[PDB]
Design an enzyme around this catalytic site. Sequence first.
Site, mmCIF file in Angstrom:
data_model
loop_
_atom_site.group_PDB
_atom_site.id
_atom_site.type_symbol
_atom_site.label_atom_id
_atom_site.label_comp_id
_atom_site.label_asym_id
_atom_site.label_seq_id
_atom_site.Cartn_x
_atom_site.Cartn_y
_atom_site.Cartn_z
ATOM 1 N N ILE A 1 0.789 -1.232 0.000
ATOM 2 C CA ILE A 1 0.000 0.000 0.000
ATOM 3 C C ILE A 1 0.827 1.291 0.000
ATOM 4 O O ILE A 1 0.502 2.229 -0.730
ATOM 5 C CB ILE A 1 -0.959 0.056 1.193
ATOM 6 C CG1 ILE A 1 -0.189 0.163 2.509
ATOM 7 C CG2 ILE A 1 -1.882 -1.154 1.212
ATOM 8 C CD1 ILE A 1 -1.097 0.186 3.721
ATOM 9 N N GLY A 2 1.899 1.324 0.774
ATOM 10 C CA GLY A 2 2.751 2.492 0.813
ATOM 11 C C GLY A 2 3.202 2.949 -0.557
ATOM 12 O O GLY A 2 3.240 4.147 -0.845
ATOM 13 N N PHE B 1 8.682 2.232 0.921
ATOM 14 C CA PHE B 1 8.994 2.645 2.279
ATOM 15 C C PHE B 1 8.157 1.927 3.341
ATOM 16 O O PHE B 1 6.939 1.843 3.246
ATOM 17 C CB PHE B 1 8.870 4.154 2.445
ATOM 18 C CG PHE B 1 7.549 4.724 2.006
ATOM 19 C CD1 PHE B 1 6.368 4.393 2.658
ATOM 20 C CD2 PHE B 1 7.500 5.656 0.977
ATOM 21 C CE1 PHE B 1 5.165 4.943 2.262
ATOM 22 C CE2 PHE B 1 6.296 6.210 0.577
ATOM 23 C CZ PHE B 1 5.127 5.843 1.209
ATOM 24 N N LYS C 1 3.386 -3.637 8.838
ATOM 25 C CA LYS C 1 4.647 -2.914 8.688
ATOM 26 C C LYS C 1 5.757 -3.781 9.229
ATOM 27 O O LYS C 1 5.813 -4.089 10.411
ATOM 28 C CB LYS C 1 4.593 -1.578 9.421
ATOM 29 C CG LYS C 1 5.583 -0.556 8.893
ATOM 30 C CD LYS C 1 5.667 0.633 9.838
ATOM 31 C CE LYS C 1 6.380 1.836 9.233
ATOM 32 N NZ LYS C 1 5.958 3.120 9.899
ATOM 33 N N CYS D 1 -7.018 0.866 7.129
ATOM 34 C CA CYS D 1 -7.814 2.049 6.822
ATOM 35 C C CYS D 1 -7.903 2.183 5.320
ATOM 36 O O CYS D 1 -6.868 2.257 4.619
ATOM 37 C CB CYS D 1 -7.204 3.311 7.449
ATOM 38 S SG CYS D 1 -7.347 3.315 9.249
ATOM 39 N N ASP E 1 5.280 14.354 13.072
ATOM 40 C CA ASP E 1 5.268 14.071 11.650
ATOM 41 C C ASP E 1 3.887 14.305 11.042
ATOM 42 O O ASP E 1 3.431 13.559 10.174
ATOM 43 C CB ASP E 1 5.792 12.660 11.380
ATOM 44 C CG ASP E 1 6.300 12.490 9.956
ATOM 45 O OD1 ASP E 1 6.596 13.516 9.303
ATOM 46 O OD2 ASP E 1 6.397 11.330 9.499
ATOM 47 N N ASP F 1 1.312 6.615 11.746
ATOM 48 C CA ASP F 1 2.755 6.778 11.615
ATOM 49 C C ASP F 1 3.400 7.463 12.807
ATOM 50 O O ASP F 1 3.745 8.644 12.757
ATOM 51 C CB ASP F 1 3.102 7.542 10.351
ATOM 52 C CG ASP F 1 4.431 7.100 9.765
ATOM 53 O OD1 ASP F 1 5.307 6.686 10.557
ATOM 54 O OD2 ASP F 1 4.584 7.174 8.522
HETATM 55 C C1 LIG Z 1 3.921 4.879 5.354
HETATM 56 N N1 LIG Z 1 3.138 5.150 6.554
HETATM 57 C C2 LIG Z 1 2.104 4.234 6.961
HETATM 58 N N2 LIG Z 1 2.288 3.197 7.852
HETATM 59 C C3 LIG Z 1 1.033 2.447 8.038
HETATM 60 C C4 LIG Z 1 1.032 1.268 8.904
HETATM 61 C C5 LIG Z 1 -0.034 2.991 7.278
HETATM 62 C C6 LIG Z 1 -1.451 2.581 7.159
HETATM 63 N N3 LIG Z 1 -2.099 2.719 5.965
HETATM 64 C C7 LIG Z 1 -3.451 2.359 5.878
HETATM 65 N N4 LIG Z 1 -4.188 2.474 4.653
HETATM 66 C C8 LIG Z 1 -3.622 3.135 3.489
HETATM 67 C C9 LIG Z 1 -2.474 3.965 3.462
HETATM 68 C C10 LIG Z 1 -2.025 4.566 2.255
HETATM 69 C C11 LIG Z 1 -2.733 4.305 1.076
HETATM 70 C C12 LIG Z 1 -3.865 3.471 1.129
HETATM 71 S S1 LIG Z 1 -4.781 3.074 -0.326
HETATM 72 N N5 LIG Z 1 -6.318 3.616 -0.134
HETATM 73 O O1 LIG Z 1 -4.754 1.623 -0.456
HETATM 74 O O2 LIG Z 1 -4.149 3.780 -1.430
HETATM 75 C C13 LIG Z 1 -4.320 2.892 2.322
HETATM 76 N N6 LIG Z 1 -4.150 1.865 6.944
HETATM 77 C C14 LIG Z 1 -3.470 1.756 8.131
HETATM 78 C C15 LIG Z 1 -2.137 2.121 8.244
HETATM 79 C C16 LIG Z 1 -1.497 2.061 9.579
HETATM 80 N N7 LIG Z 1 -0.987 1.953 10.604
HETATM 81 S S2 LIG Z 1 0.548 4.193 6.461
#
Ligand SMILES: CNc1nc(C)c(-c2nc(Nc3cccc(S(N)(=O)=O)c3)ncc2C#N)s1
Lengths: 252, 309
Positions: free
Chosen positions: B21-22, B26, B44, B93, B136, B154
């Site tokens: 997803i990131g 990263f 993560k 999320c 951040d 984060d």
């Molecule tokens: C790089 N920073 C992040 N660490 C975590 C663990 C993150 C995180 N991200 C999501 N969802 C999410 C994040 C970016 C993009 C998309 S999408 N709609 O697929 O493009 C979904 N949910 C939970 C976490 C947590 N913790 S982001």
Amino acid sequence: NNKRWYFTREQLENSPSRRFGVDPDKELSYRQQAANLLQDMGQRLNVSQLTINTAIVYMHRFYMIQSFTRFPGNSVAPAALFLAAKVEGQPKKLEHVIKVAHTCLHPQESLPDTRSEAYLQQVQDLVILESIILQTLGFELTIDHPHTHVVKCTQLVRASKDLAQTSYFMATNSLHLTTFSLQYTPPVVACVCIHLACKWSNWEIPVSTDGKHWWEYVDATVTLELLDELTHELLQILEKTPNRLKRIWNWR
Amino acid sequence: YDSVECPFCDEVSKYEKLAKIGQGTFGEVFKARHRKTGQKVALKKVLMENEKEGFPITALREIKILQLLKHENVVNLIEICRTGSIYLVFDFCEHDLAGLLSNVLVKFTLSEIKRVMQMLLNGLYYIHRNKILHRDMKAANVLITRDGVLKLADFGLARAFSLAPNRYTNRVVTLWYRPPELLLGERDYGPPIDLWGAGCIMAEMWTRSPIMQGNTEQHQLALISQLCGSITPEVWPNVDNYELYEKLELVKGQKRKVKDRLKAYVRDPYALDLIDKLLVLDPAQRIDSDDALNHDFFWSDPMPSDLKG
Ligand SMILES: CNc1nc(C)c(-c2nc(Nc3cccc(S(N)(=O)=O)c3)ncc2C#N)s1
């Protein structure tokens, strides 16, 4: 869970170590030893008692899951301390910790060449063990600091520096010498240490203007029956510990 | 060689990976599916690159903080999983604010933007109440659940704070959302720095793009002065005693155009007034999480609305 790391006496009887043929007695010693090693190393590494305690608690909990027959204290302790130091913001360098462990466990033995296979090995061995600790504790490393409680306690009871000093003494020893931290919450243990400190120094705390005893203002669960039982146990092992009592004994 | 007990640390294999997803190479952050319940989560991995001191102390800190912070507007750590390698497991999320803001199709009503800002400020109030600085703040670190609930995410650079004189780390926070205090070299800061970040995000809710995109710290500090005026002991009492004050080449004829420059994008006067109180130079006079939630912006029409749309 809130009560995951609190155990009944029966659970304490059926420890992982008992399962591998370790007498209740030996186990308790194995614990006390580890606690001493932690104290010795921590003092030399110049970290706080808070951190040393934190390491001791990790140790106690670690051995409710693992057996002494599989993990010697002399191994777990240095790893646990290394970890505790990091968690409490007094990080000590890995080389530094391995160095001090070595001389505590082998005062005479000759320090190895930090280039040798045997040394590079024991460096990674410690790291590996830190990991087995983290996983055994399920990455739950925030400890509820027992001293903070004794302070508030002795204070909301107005005790002399001496009475207070002595209570802290009781607390620190209860950690090395007993498994109270595995059975009773910090606030309770704090009462136990204050009770015994008063008994030891002939101090008598007057009943509040109501008729309620001081400890009821510290913890609702606490009873005089329990306090007497636990102080007796702690005093018994204190009497078995050479010179320990001499430290708070009124020589005048 | 023999297997050992671990009742309290499950193997991450219980989750089935789906997609990174990131997308920024990263974190090694994946979307996953619990193999039994279909529950979606985010994984993560704990980066072990050049870890010479065992388990990364920075991981330990973040873990300590995620375990402490339990709140409807803060990302939720479900558990930590093993494998040797280690994974933080989060409630998944659906969206994140940065992506929504960049998506031309997505569109917020004033009423909904109010709700977002409300949840975000609530989150901050909570984490600060718990002696944590996020450090951040940026749209990218702000997620929204499929049900329209905002989560601050984060905490890798977050840290506990307190009263004592403090010596905290300086080069925290993405450049564009970094506040004046830091850029002047302050190491005894606090919660006000997250609010500055909230400010840039609030404004970003209409501009759909980070307001101040500097290349370097002096470049950034230039941009800020060309929005909030220039640093004056009159405007910011005691700025003087910071060694880099004019020693960082700063202008002298700058007068605050926060309300003028954004007048265009934001209509509602309350919205502008709140932004103006967030993007204040002197951290000590910068509005705080509590006062902000009290601001008439949240108590005027249209009142804040839920946002499943
Ligand atoms: C790089 N920073 C992040 N660490 C975590 C663990 C993150 C995180 N991200 C999501 N969802 C999410 C994040 C970016 C993009 C998309 S999408 N709609 O697929 O493009 C979904 N949910 C939970 C976490 C947590 N913790 S982001």
